[PDB]
Design a binder for this molecule. Structure first.
Ligand SMILES: *[C@@H]1O[C@H](CO)[C@@H](O)[C@H](O)[C@H]1NC(C)=O
Ligand SMILES: *[C@@H]1O[C@H](CO)[C@@H](O)[C@H](O)[C@H]1NC(C)=O
Ligand SMILES: *[C@@H]1O[C@H](CO)[C@@H](O)[C@H](O)[C@H]1NC(C)=O
Ligand SMILES: *[C@@H]1O[C@H](CO)[C@@H](O)[C@H](O)[C@H]1NC(C)=O
Lengths: 217, 219
């Protein structure tokens, strides 16, 4: 029943990741006693939501691994670059606002007449002979992966995805829903053979929309 | 003739001198290292452009030679930051992946840091361990250290200083002189006993006229 320091931290990280809408499952059993024994405060959804908000926006100086700022085992506050929120089943490298100097979340675009090296206003494809990166500029327009293993980078949180379907982006709640403005999807060509991305390619100052299936390898 | 590592350190030395971070350099044999390894000329124009592309208009990946896009620097396996280390001075410079750079009136204290009432300075003491940070908000107004060893952080480049006098900040040239918008000065109290920082404390509604009085921060 009693949870150790690392186990309680991993459960704390697991719930924070689920509120970020990065994972679809969680394991948060036993977190109430770990908080009231180490943190000393309640760990309800309000506590976490405020912690996520304070971390990604309105950040102030240093913090701790429990994502607490200040203007017993987590009182050292030797963290300002980034924080590695790792629950054991899914890891994420999240960057605080203290490192950055997120949009406030749309419309549906009309249809234009190929669905299968592209020419999209919303997509930027780069090929490094060293991998393939497909940067997107319209994060609300989704890019569903299929039979793929990617790592997506951003200015809010970097992490790797293998679940097929819609890409899960972090979403902060502070007077509304805040989503990143743009994210980049890197794909290792050397296991990713049958990887297919289905997206909506945008053609031009009115914009147009047509589906396309971009496959790598 | 200079080896690969030695040529890189001299390459870093010239970039550091152009950044106005160091006052001395060792660049003898650097042109031969460039035309033999880089394949391009290594004049002040070449370096100035490399500094320009690195700190502004940066786009994606680069190499330790500050080039963006047997050729030992064609793999472009470098992201995040670059450690410009010449052997005599190290600096962790971050690419964008800067202000453009007035006199304030005078007001009538001459010396703790718990209270300095400065609009230009934000003094924090981290009892969280053993360190003192004095954030500055007006980089043009200089803070001269005396008998001190600090490490200054910024959004352009982190490095440590021990030379007494004005703090040396990076300066990028692109249609003008660009300096960082704000820098942080950390001081480890646990060798840094005789440290004295002399700065211009800013005192005194939106209609408030701006004022200035000298102050000597003792640690
Ligand atoms: C975000 O947008 C919503 C739109 O209704 C608005 O109500 C809210 O105040 C905005 N929040 C911020 C922080 O801009
Ligand atoms: C991604 O999947 C969702 C859910 O089925 C779908 O509505 C959307 O159209 C897909 N993406 C594109 C670009 O079609
Ligand atoms: C700085 O001033 C110079 C000289 O007028 C100008 O060319 C340059 O665009 C300015 N840069 C910024 C960022 O204001
Ligand atoms: C620092 O040194 C310069 C040297 O010219 C001097 O003018 C200035 O008054 C000193 N103090 C400050 C706060 O800059």
């Amino acid at each position: 029943i009693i949870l150790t320091l690392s186990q309680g931290l991993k459960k704390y990280y697991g719930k924070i990741l689920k509120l970020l809408h990065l994972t679809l499952e969680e394991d948060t059993e036993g977190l109430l006693e770990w908080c009231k024994r180490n943190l000393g405060s309640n760990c309800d959804d309000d506590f976490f939501q405020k912690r996520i908000e304070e971390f990604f926006i309105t950040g102030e100086g240093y913090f701790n691994e429990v994502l607490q700022f200040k203007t017993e085992p987590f009182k050292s506050y030797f963290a300002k670059g980034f924080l590695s929120i790792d629950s054991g089943y899914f890891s994420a490298k999240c960057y605080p606002r203290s490192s950055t100097s997120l949009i406030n979340v749309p419309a549906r675009i009309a249809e234009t007449p190929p669905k299968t090296t592209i020419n999209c206003i919303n997509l930027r494809a780069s090929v490094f002979k060293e991998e393939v990166e497909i940067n997107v500029l319209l994060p609300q327009i989704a890019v569903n992966l299929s039979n793929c293993h990617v790592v997506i980078n951003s200015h809010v949180c970097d992490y790797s995805l293998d679940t097929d379907g819609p890409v899960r982006l972090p979403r902060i709640y502070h007077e509304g829903t805040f989503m990143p403005g743009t994210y980049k999807i890197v794909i290792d060509r050397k296991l990713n053979d049958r990887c297919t991305l289905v997206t909506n390619c945008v053609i031009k100052s009115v914009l147009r929309q047509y589906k396309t299936e971009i496959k790598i390898g």
